[PDB]
Design a protein around this ligand. Structure first.
Ligand SMILES: CCOP(O)(=S)OCC
Ligand SMILES: CCOP(O)(=S)OCC
Ligand SMILES: [Fe+2]
Ligand SMILES: [Fe+2]
Lengths: 329, 329
């Protein structure tokens, strides 16, 4: 009681977040793209209706909150989010930060300037909205570019000032979390404020447990992503991998087994629109996982339960861990 | 009489364009940047006031029209343009196309899809505005990337369908215009519909005359850009060059001398806001050329006149050539 998190619809008690998906997207896009070329998505109205149907479905499966980790460079549209949230009756936490597609106007900025930009989105609001970010997203793909280091640092500085957490994109098989951790630690950020994302993209428990031992949250956030039985499509193969959802799901159990149940964050990394990819890739995705953001409660939790993970443990993972992570600290 | 060009304020007779700067910017930015972080520019209001003061000044010097060649990826804000145009009483033609900073949502698109995007901006309007583009901007920096080839082709296809002209960014010293020309010609575009930009960045008349002989318009569009007496600042040196404005201006005379007066387009490539660059670079620019978009009528035309270029020739360059270029053909 009495700790608050900013949502697209305004503030809520942390205790009201409930079953929370911590790495999600309404639309995966680019800044200004949705405004410029709505027809790409059929229409803006079509995209919203699809997101509402999707989020209604998640909600029926027990999801009460999602964190949309779309940054300015993922084409985050806070008005869209608010609209869909209201319609679906699902809370959405918005993000600041930057992903690996920053435009030059961002790439030319100093660490100080980036810090002011993240803070503005957190403390003041996004664009002219008044809608405040509840999280900061950052990214690497392998070893950090020099700009990427500035971003990670600005992210840490913003976090220290606000108590808002940081979440990351990684190339998991390259073990990016180790560098990201060092940089965050250099800025003095507590690891408990940090989630190392896409960690389910690897089965290297040495890497994962090492992070969890330091106190980092480990994001097992691409649960539905598999290219199996779609070995034809090269684009899909790179995007989705050859590991099954079950293989990915087992990692949650593996961590719990190693004593790290408190350090786990679980998600889909789903979206309802996808311009960042070739045009077919939305539909291919919907064929593979028609349950969308319902997948984790429908398929993952029962699988874990059948494997012996206790229901209270499952609750701690899906409710307590997000609540603790989100709570400005 | 009776040929029309689309402006941000609506259609105008071609004959009303008058003294026209064909390669300009209100703001050089990135998609959504101005919406997200207006404080970068002091405020949106500050940026507009500066643009109005600048364009008032140009107007007093005789400029009646400018073509803002800012694309979606240069952070073109058509509402801003309309506002400033109205206030300054200077016509602004808006652009479609893409520059060399396209986001992934664009980079993932097919040639067909790009063609539909350019056409939408031309035939329907930009964003939800109803404001139609009067020109298509495209770019290379050296030899074309494969995506850049698709863009050039989509640009040609849109042009053929509309009669709207194409203008380019080049790495002039690498002679990009020759490749760009070949691609446009492959798509069947007339060279008279095309301007090969930043051609004043080189003194290679062999390259320039070769283009002019084929019927291309040659854009001598960075007239005020010189780093001389600023040999300290490395950033400026790359951006502005070591050639004087006079050296750049002489090229106009050189072309006229070679019989190509009808093939010349003249400009500044100025802007009033600049996020695409490091933070100081706006102010450095304003110190060098306080006249802004007035520079060409103030300094360039008189220099040419003093060198013997006839006033009627100067008129043909600054009025007739733009009119002919802009007129949907
Ligand atoms: C395939 C989904 O990948 P991301 O989390 S990097 O974001 C793109 C929206
Ligand atoms: C220095 C001005 O360069 P550009 O024409 S490439 O556009 C940036 C606005
Ligand atoms: Fe994501
Ligand atoms: Fe330009």
């Amino acid at each position: 009681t009495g700790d608050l998190i900013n949502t697209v619809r305004g503030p809520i008690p942390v205790s009201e977040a409930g079953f929370t998906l911590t790495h999600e997207h309404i639309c995966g896009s680019s800044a200004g793209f949705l405004r410029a070329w709505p027809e790409f998505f059929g229409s803006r109205k079509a995209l919203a209706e699809k997101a509402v149907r999707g989020l209604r479905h998640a909600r029926a499966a027990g999801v009460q909150t999602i964190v949309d980790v779309s940054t300015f460079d993922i084409g985050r549209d806070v008005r869209l989010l608010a609209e869909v949230s209201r319609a679906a009756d699902v809370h959405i936490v918005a993000a600041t930060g930057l992903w690996f597609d920053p435009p030059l106007s961002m790439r030319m900025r100093s660490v100080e300037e980036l810090t002011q930009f993240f803070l503005r989105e957190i403390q003041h609001g996004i664009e002219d909205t008044g809608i405040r970010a509840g999280i900061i997203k950052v990214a690497t793909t392998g070893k950090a570019t020099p700009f990427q280091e500035l971003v990670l640092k600005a992210a840490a500085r913003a976090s220290l000032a606000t108590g808002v957490p940081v979440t990351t994109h990684t190339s998991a098989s390259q073990r990016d979390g180790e560098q990201q951790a060092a940089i965050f630690e250099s800025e003095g950020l507590s690891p408990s404020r940090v989630c190392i994302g896409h960690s389910d993209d690897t089965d290297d428990l040495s890497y994962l447990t090492g992070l969890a031992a330091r106190g980092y949250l480990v994001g097992l956030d691409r649960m539905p992503y598999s290219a199996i039985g779609l070995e034809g499509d090269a684009s899909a193969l790179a995007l989705f991998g050859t590991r099954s959802w079950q293989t990915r799901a087992l990692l949650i159990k593996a961590l719990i087994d190693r004593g790290y149940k408190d350090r786990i964050l679980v998600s889909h990394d789903w979206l309802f629109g996808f311009s960042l990819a070739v045009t077919n890739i939305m539909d291919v995705m919907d064929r593979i996982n028609p349950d969308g953001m319902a997948f984790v409660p429908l398929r993952v939790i029962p699988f874990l339960r059948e494997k012996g993970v206790p229901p209270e443990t499952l609750a701690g993972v899906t409710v307590a861990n997000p609540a603790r992570f989100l709570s400005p600290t």
